[PDB]
Design a protein around this ligand. Structure first.
Ligand SMILES: Nc1ncnc2c1ncn2[C@@H]1O[C@H](COP(=O)(O)OP(=O)(O)O)[C@@H](O)[C@H]1O
Ligand SMILES: [Mg+2]
Length: 719
């Protein structure tokens, strides 16, 4: 028994070591108030009903107020598995426990409802079959923190409550959302699939494929997910996997035509370029990424510790497993290839405010591979017909404009293709006969970058709703766990409203209004916003100086956004003639992408914001029907290094994500101040022996709710 077997890897890697043997007061102080996050521990030389006085590291005293005191929990608490047990809940205290664990390579910790996960940035052998095996049917409290644990508890709850389940895994980029997501899947595939089982493999083989097309190297992660996802794992009434469905969100289509220095475009481009046969290449009029605009710009065409070649095998291999037809494949690759050619096209001004395509090279390559007609692509690109009254005139675009349309084309295609891959995969995996499901959400948390644009507002709106769901969930519990004699998600409402309100109209509604609109510009747009909200809506901020930015007070703080391009982004335009050109494609796949309203169109067309709000609401509607579980993935630093947990990087995250918030209530909100077993009837004996004060202690029903007080003096007592 590994749980019992202290030699087991289980014990080693998942537990704080058991050294079986069977008067002071510290604080976390900051030797630099300018460094709110760089504490030190100091001893309290004494108190005063009003304050505390300790001893700096230097051993040269200072003195704060009790009510300002970041008291250090007793050392015995150092490494506890759930922050719900700490006496002292305060930032540094919290950090300190995470740290102590992280230092022992214990990346998982609970904080009440939350599973906190700190990326280790190195391999930790804990996702082995043996490891799976150990987690089966065990309660959270019976085994070490782990993503398998949460996964198991959701699976049991599902079988026991006959209720759908959900797992919400969020956090910043490179924090390990995706890692944890796969493990959830893996564990589920193991504990509930076929042993002595094809659907499972298929279900598994779907992630590699989506990753090839939707992930990429960024400066924060070598395999960034450039789309959000919701994985519905489907079970029959017996508790075995019947199927699966994937919902994707906000693919970063722009990355196809532009990548920052050092980053890469999507994986697949490289894999394709480096994995194709000497024969498909030329067949594909292919060449090296060096020779490709969309791949020659960032200075990076490689990922260290990565073989595009080998990875291409997989993708392919996976394609076969799921079921893509060889031709479907080729076609899928033709698109990629196609896309590459288009990036190669070069518009020059050949006479006067008009682009000319002097070199028909790249054009031919694109077309040929797209199975479209060189002549109309061209005309669709450089001279699209534009409706101007009754009039449908062909319009000659300059060079700039011509390129952007070309880019718009590249993006729809990429975007469209992804859309298709997802459906096609669903076709193969999906079951609406399902009894139940366990859904896993893998998407970024709040995002505050150097520059925040329309995409960040969306992500942050979602986060705003996810956090209110958490808060509400959390009050339900309390409320219900009180069948006897403070709604928290009400607090997220104003922000939510500012963004999505209808009347008065919020940011999105104003944006939509402007997108139809005649006098349509980024400047009219930003003016309307301040006009409606500056000094008028408490969650809004008009900048002292920028004329192109605005601030929203989000849950996790203010985020300044920039409006450049919102109108275009909201409309996501694509020249219809261009729609026309492709509509008539030789390719069977290309045709779908342009002929299938379900693919080639948004839902009388709605805008991007409108589509986003909707898919957000649908998502939430779904969640509301589940028993949710919460996973907060934490990045330990910004260097992609193990062993380096920087205070500041960490505390920021615990404030944004709501572990910290969620916690502080965990002071008042003292359920988990239930030491059913403690140092029941003599459990007042003790209180009566040490004669502690009534109303710091609490008698539940054999259960409990003790005091985050004497409790933290009530342990290193000599008796
Ligand atoms: N449990 C884990 N063990 C090892 N590496 C991990 C773990 N979680 C994340 N990582 C590391 O971080 C990198 C990025 O993590 P990832 O799951 O992709 O984050 P996210 O999806 O949150 O952007 C991984 O590819 C890996 O190197
Ligand atoms: Mg990811």
């Amino acid at each position: 028994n590994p749980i019992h077997d202290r030699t087991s890897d289980y014990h080693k890697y998942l537990k704080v070591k058991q050294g079986d043997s069977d008067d002071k007061r510290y604080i976390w102080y900051n030797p630099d108030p300018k460094e709110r996050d760089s504490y030190e521990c100091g001893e309290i030389v004494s108190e005063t009903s009003d304050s505390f006085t300790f001893k700096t590291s230097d051993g040269q005293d200072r003195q704060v107020k009790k009510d300002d005191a970041n008291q250090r929990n007793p050392i015995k608490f150092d490494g506890v598995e759930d922050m719900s047990e700490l006496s002292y809940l305060n930032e540094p205290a919290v950090f300190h426990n995470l740290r102590v664990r992280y230092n022992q390579d214990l990346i998982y910790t609970y904080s009440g409802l939350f599973l906190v996960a700190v990326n280790p940035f190195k391999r930790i052998p804990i996702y082995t079959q043996e490891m799976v095996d150990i987690f089966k049917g065990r309660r959270r409290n019976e085994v070490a923190p782990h993503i398998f644990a949460i996964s198991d508890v959701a699976y049991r709850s599902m079988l026991d409550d006959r209720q759908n389940q959900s797992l919400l895994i969020t956090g910043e980029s490179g924090a390990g959302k995706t890692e944890n997501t796969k493990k959830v899947i893996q564990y589920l595939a193991s504990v509930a699939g076929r042993n002595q089982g094809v659907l499972e493999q298929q279900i598994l083989q779907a992630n590699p494929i989506l990753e090839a097309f939707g992930n990429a190297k960024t400066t924060r992660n070598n395999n960034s997910s450039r789309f959000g996802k919701f994985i519905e794992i489907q079970f029959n009434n017996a508790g075995f996997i019947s199927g699966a469905s994937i919902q994707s969100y906000l693919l970063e289509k722009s990355r196809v035509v532009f990548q920052s220095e050092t980053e890469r475009n999507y994986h697949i481009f490289y894999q394709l370029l480096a994995g194709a046969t000497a024969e498909e290449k030329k067949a594909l009029h292919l060449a090296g990424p060096e020779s490709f605009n969309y791949l020659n710009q960032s200075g990076c065409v490689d990922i260290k510790g990565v073989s595009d070649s080998e990875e291409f095998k997989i993708t392919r291999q996976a394609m076969d497993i799921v079921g893509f037809s060889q031709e479907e494949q080729m076609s899928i690759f033709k698109i990629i290839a196609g896309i590459l050619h288009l990036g190669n096209i070069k518009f020059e001004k050949g006479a006067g405010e008009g682009a000319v395509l002097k070199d028909k090279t790249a054009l031919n390559a694109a077309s040929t591979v797209f199975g479209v007609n060189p002549s109309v692509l061209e005309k669709a690109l450089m001279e699209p017909r534009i409706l101007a009254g009754r009039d449908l005139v062909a319009q000659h675009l300059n060079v700039e404009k011509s390129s952007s349309s070309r880019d718009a084309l590249v993006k729809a295609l990429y975007g469209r293709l992804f859309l298709w891959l997802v459906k096609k995969i669903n076709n193969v995996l999906c079951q609406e006969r399902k009894a139940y499901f366990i859904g896993v959400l893998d998407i970024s948390g709040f995002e505050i970058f150097k520059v925040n644009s329309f995409e960040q507002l969306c992500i942050n709106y979602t986060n705003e709703k996810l956090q209110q769901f958490f808060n509400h969930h959390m009050f339900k519990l309390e409320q219900e766990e009180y069948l006897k004699e403070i709604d928290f998600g009400l607090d997220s409402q104003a922000t939510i409203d500012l963004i999505d309100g209808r009347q008065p109209p919020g940011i999105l509604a104003l944006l939509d209004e402007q997108s139809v609109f005649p006098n349509a510009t980024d400047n009219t747009l930003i003016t309307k916003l301040h006009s409606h909200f500056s000094k008028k809506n408490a969650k809004y901020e008009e900048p002292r100086f920028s004329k192109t930015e605005f601030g929203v007070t989000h849950y996790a703080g203010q985020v300044m956004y920039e409006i450049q391009d919102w109108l275009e982004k909201n409309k996501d335009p694509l020249q219809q003639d261009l729609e026309l050109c492709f509509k008539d494609s030789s390719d069977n796949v290309v045709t779908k992408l342009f002929n299938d309203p379900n693919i080639a169109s948004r839902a009388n067309f709605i805008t991007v914001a409108a589509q986003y709000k909707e898919q957000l609401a649908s998502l939430m509607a779904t969640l509301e029907t589940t028993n949710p579980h919460f996973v907060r993935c934490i990045i330990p630093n910004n260097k992609q290094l193990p062993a380096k947990l920087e205070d500041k990087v960490v505390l920021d995250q615990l404030r944004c994500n709501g572990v910290l918030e969620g916690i502080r209530i965990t002071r008042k909100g003292f359920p988990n101040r239930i030491i059913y077993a403690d140092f029941q009837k003599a459990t007042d004996a003790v209180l009566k022996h040490l004669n502690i004060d009534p109303e710091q202690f609490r008698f539940g029903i054999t259960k409990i709710f003790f005091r985050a007080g004497q409790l933290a003096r009530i342990e290193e007592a000599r008796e």
